[PDB]
Design a protein around this ligand. Structure first.
Ligand SMILES: CC(C)C[C@H](N)C(=O)NS(=O)(=O)OC[C@H]1O[C@@H](n2cnc3c(N)ncnc32)[C@H](O)[C@@H]1O
Ligand SMILES: CCC[C@H](N)C(=O)N[C@@H]1[C@H](O)[C@@H](CO)O[C@H]1n1cnc2c(N)ncnc21
Ligand SMILES: [Mg+2]
Ligand SMILES: [Zn+2]
Length: 862
RNA sequence: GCCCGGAUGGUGGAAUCGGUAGACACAAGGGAUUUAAAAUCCCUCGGCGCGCGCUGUGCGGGUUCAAGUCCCGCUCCGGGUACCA
């Protein structure tokens, strides 16, 4: 029980971290007496090392968790591991191991790094998603979803390197060819399992209105991703072809100006025409090189070839040419469209290139015929050049042609969504196996309940090309309904495990079912959910979707999983690479790469310690993929966890995208030494007297105002705003004022006790290790972790005056202190007494006066 | 391409509901203690020409008494784009 002069983190931090582990401070149960607060950070993929992206996410959470703990609540802050994934396979092959032990090594290493950063997690509720204790229940749930009719199998496009005969990911393809071998990747239609997320398309879209504490950035992204759309599916007939063509459109009003139809590459009409036509056959085989990604679909030049078959326009009775094209999506809509080039900018460029007919049917705003020499007229208006449908407005023209095509019996109104169904089949090893069984009959059915879980074997060896569970034919064998059967070798998408980990944290050792609803509904829904903006759409839409499925199974009460979403900004860093000797992308770290910069700041050249011409790919999010992550363990060993934690929070507000930099860490270490020095000098003098409230000087009253005003600001900045940089900045101001304040008399040292006890509590969320020690030295009640959050004294914060700015034609000339209860006439009189104000008022008249109470006075002058 | 964000001194940022632009820090320069250094404490710090005047928040216009903040048109950079997680 003795404080050193010098602040030594290495001696303090490890000793306090053991105390938290041994006393089980952050381990919690479902306490009915206390108020719950579920503070959830998104669980990491165990890549190997942590990086400053991870540190920002998990400090932000731990700040809120420790803050909410000090408000007197039972705070659950869990931590787990999204263990399944693609990187584990490639790394296992490269390092000559299996994917399982590689993943458990990386979990072990990262568990240490998190513990040394001192995040108050509930380690008794730890989860690894690659263990069968976890994935047994999602398998069991998948079979339940099949029996409800929410699962179905269909053919879907997949990236396929033809030589190796393996399914590649989107990341594994680069610049057309495959990243291993010099051979072009091709689209391959392959049967896969899907879950009907479109069944909950409206509910996912509509419930965004109820999420008031989610940011509008994420909500509007999810609305646009789902893309609910009311329109008409119009059917056609073809001359020398039996099968009809159905097309979707939101603009049936412009149907009479439909000069041609565009068709997707993988449409069954195009296959019939390609038998005789040699150039059309070459176009379809060229569309094999089209990648499975919407980025490369639209960015490329919109090419096309005439099919030959002429579709009959049902209303006009005219033959129109069907065309193949590489900008028309297969899975969105039917496959084909009703291309109106006169009133669509995408179709206009297609019609202008190939010289197709451009028919105008919609009048302009003024009632005049449109001018379609330069561009299309996307706007909606009155019809003309459309037979019986002339004169009608957009609302009438929508209904008229819809009622006509419903009456004719070759058309119907339909609610189409952009949202496609969630394809969950993957053909890799390191994943939870899909519980489906193909019998010797030929019939497919779910794996029965007694045979679950379908355990993935960890003890294996991988060649790299084919999966071990696929390669060995003995694994698939089983016996269902008293006959031979072959279970599904496809494994789940890793989003499957991340779509219910939040629920399983409430009851992670529960052997009887998927969720213990007593425990689940106590904690759920999640109060604050903290992740990257990267997961705005993909994960967060599955996350919610899965909650609604679990609700309909009677597992959980709430309609939504998370109350508040806090999407922190991506921690950015530069990313370099060089092409290998066999076309393999070797990403070099920024530390290794020597760089020559521009005068503005941009990068021009990029060498490395070896000597390769590196390819600079701009700033990008820290990740092991691009090899630009910065390990915090170097800075933690040098400066301490608290220093690194405080710097991450001080550099920018949570939601803002930060470019990572080393310059700034020294300011945090200097600040903590100043806090340590002020308490050392204070406590060394001795104990303190009781504080006399109404016996202070004007300096002492003003100082105590700034103490309680900081408590009000820091409470608002942490609680409501999550602007931790301004909260920390506010405390830095107070510490500078406390340093200058003399602590000679008993009233000053009594004030300094209240100040330091307040400042140490306000810093505890950010820098918990140093504050735990200083709390004992200031002689507070128990541990700082469970100690109460400071409440500001409204009597202490009362002002006797306020600053008023004086402007003359919107430009500041003087500044004055004025009493709070002061009229506009008193402020004008005081403002006139200033010499810089009266300088510009002479020779001219006061035309208009603008006065903001207690803030600003602007004099408009002629 | 499409959807969603971002840009403020040498650098990260502040200004919370249209109202003092640059709080709080880092880096740099000079001064002070110091056996020299480390460590600590001071001073200066957007630009152009003074105990003053104009100008200044990525670029071009606009509204207003007042714009970093609101409106219209752009540039550049990030995130997602359905098999990275
Ligand atoms: C639920 C599941 C789908 C999550 C998934 N397992 C996952 O994302 N795993 S993880 O290892 O990549 O990250 C864990 C957390 O850290 C954030 N993060 C990652 N990189 C950065 C960065 N450069 N900057 C800021 N934050 C980053 C990320 O959003 C997440 O909250
Ligand atoms: C006045 C011009 C009318 C225009 N010609 C039109 O009908 N466009 C379709 C519809 O209006 C819109 C719905 O999002 O996208 C188009 N669309 C529908 N399905 C698809 C698809 N599979 N691929 C590309 N676009 C599509
Ligand atoms: Mg700049
Ligand atoms: Zn290949």
């Amino acid at each position: 029980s003795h404080m050193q002069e010098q602040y030594r983190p290495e001696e303090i931090e490890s000793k306090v971290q053991l105390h938290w582990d041994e006393k089980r401070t952050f381990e919690v149960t479902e306490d009915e007496s206390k108020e719950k607060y579920y503070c959830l950070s998104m669980l990491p993929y165990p890549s190997g090392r942590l990086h400053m992206g991870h540190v920002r996410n998990y400090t932000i959470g731990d700040v809120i968790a420790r803050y909410q703990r000090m408000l007197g609540k039972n705070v659950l802050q869990p931590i787990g591991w999204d263990a399944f994934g693609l990187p584990a396979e490639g790394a296992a092959v490269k390092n000559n191991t299996a994917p399982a032990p590689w993943t458990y090594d990386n979990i072990a290493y990262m568990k240490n790094q998190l513990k040394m950063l001192g995040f108050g997690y509930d380690w008794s509720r730890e989860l690894a998603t690659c263990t069968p204790e976890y994935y047994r229940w999602e398998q069991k749930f998948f079979t339940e979803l099949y029996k409800k009719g929410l699962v179905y199998k269909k053919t879907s496009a997949v990236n396929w390197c033809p030589n190796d005969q393996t399914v590649l990911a989107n990341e594994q393809v680069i610049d057309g060819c495959c990243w291993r071998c010099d051979t072009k990747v091709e689209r391959k239609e392959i049967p896969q399992w899907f879950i009907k997320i479109t069944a909950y398309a409206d509910e996912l879209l509509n419930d965004l209105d109820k999420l008031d504490h989610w940011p509008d950035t994420v909500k509007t992204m999810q609305r646009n991703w789902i893309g609910r759309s009311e329109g008409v599916e119009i059917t056609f007939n073809v001359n020398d072809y039996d099968n009809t063509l159905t097309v979707y459109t939101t603009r049936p009003d412009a149907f009479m100006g439909c000069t041609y139809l565009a068709v997707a590459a993988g449409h069954p009409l195009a296959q019939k025409a390609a038998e005789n036509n040699p150039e059309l056959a070459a176009f379809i085989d060229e569309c094999r090189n089209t990648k499975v990604a919407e980025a490369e679909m639209a960015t490329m030049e919109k090419k096309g070839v005439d099919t030959g078959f002429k579709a009959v326009h049902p209303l006009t009775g005219e033959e129109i040419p069907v065309w193949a094209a590489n900008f028309v999506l297969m899975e969105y809509g039917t496959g084909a469209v009703m291309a109106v080039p006169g009133h669509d900018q995408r179709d206009y460029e297609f019609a202008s290139k190939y010289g197709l007919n451009i028919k105008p049917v919609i009048l302009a705003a003024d009632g005049s015929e449109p001018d379609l020499s330069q561009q299309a007229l996307t706007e909606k208006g009155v019809l003309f050049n459309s037979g019986e449908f002339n004169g009608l407005d957009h609302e009438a023209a929508f209904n008229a042609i819809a009622d006509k095509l419903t009456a004719m019996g070759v058309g119907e109104r339909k609610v189409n969504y952009r949202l496609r169904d969630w394809g969950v089949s993957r053909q890799r090893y390191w994943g939870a196996p899909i519980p489906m069984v193909t019998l010797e009959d030929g019939t497919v059915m779910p794996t029965p309940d007694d045979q679950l879980p379908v355990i993935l074997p960890e003890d294996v060896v991988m060649d790299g090309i084919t999966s071990p569970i696929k390669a060995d034919p003995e694994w698939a064998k089983t016996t269902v309904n008293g006959m031979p059967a072959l279970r599904e070798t496809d494994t789940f998408d890793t989003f499957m495990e991340s779509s219910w980990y939040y629920a399983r944290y409430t009851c992670p050792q529960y052997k009887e079912g998927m969720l213990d609803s007593e425990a689940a509904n106590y904690w759920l829904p999640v109060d604050i959910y903290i992740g990257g903006i990267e997961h705005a759409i993909m994960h967060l839409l599955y996350f919610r979707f899965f909650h609604k499925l679990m609700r309909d199974a009677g597992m959980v009460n709430s309609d939504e999983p998370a109350k508040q979403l806090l999407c922190q900004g991506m921690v950015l860093a530069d990313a370099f690479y060089y092409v290998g000797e066999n076309g393999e992308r070797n990403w070099v770290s920024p530390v290794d790469a020597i760089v020559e910069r521009d005068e503005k700041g941009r990068i021009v050249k990029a060498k490395d310690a070896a000597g390769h011409e590196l390819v600079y790919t701009g700033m990008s999010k820290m990740s092991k993929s691009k090899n630009n992550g910065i390990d915090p363990q170097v800075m933690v060993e040098r400066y301490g966890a608290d220093t690194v934690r405080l710097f991450m929070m001080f550099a920018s507000p949570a939601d803002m995208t930060l470019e990572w930099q080393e310059s700034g860490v020294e300011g945090a270490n200097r600040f903590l030494k100043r806090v340590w020095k002020l308490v050392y000098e204070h406590t060394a003098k001795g104990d303190v007297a009781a504080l006399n409230v109404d016996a202070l000087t004007e300096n002492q009253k003003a100082l105590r105002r700034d103490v309680h005003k900081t408590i009000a600001k820091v409470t608002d900045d942490i609680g409501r705003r999550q602007t931790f940089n301004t909260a920390i900045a506010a405390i830095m101001e107070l510490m500078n004022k406390l340093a200058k304040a003399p602590t000679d008399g008993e009233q000053d040292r009594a004030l300094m006790q209240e100040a330091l006890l307040a400042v140490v509590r306000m810093l505890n969320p950010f820098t918990p290790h140093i504050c735990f020690t200083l709390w004992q030295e200031l002689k507070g009640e128990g541990d700082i972790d469970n100690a109460p959050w400071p409440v500001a004294d409204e009597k202490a914060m009362v002002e006797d005056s306020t600053l008023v700015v004086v402007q003359v034609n919107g430009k500041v000339r003087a500044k004055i202190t004025v009493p709070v209860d002061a009229t506009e006439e008193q402020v004008r009189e005081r403002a006139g007494q200033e010499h810089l104000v009266a300088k510009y008022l002479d020779g001219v008249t006061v035309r208009k006066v603008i006065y903001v109470p207690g803030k600003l006075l602007n004099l408009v002058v002629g």
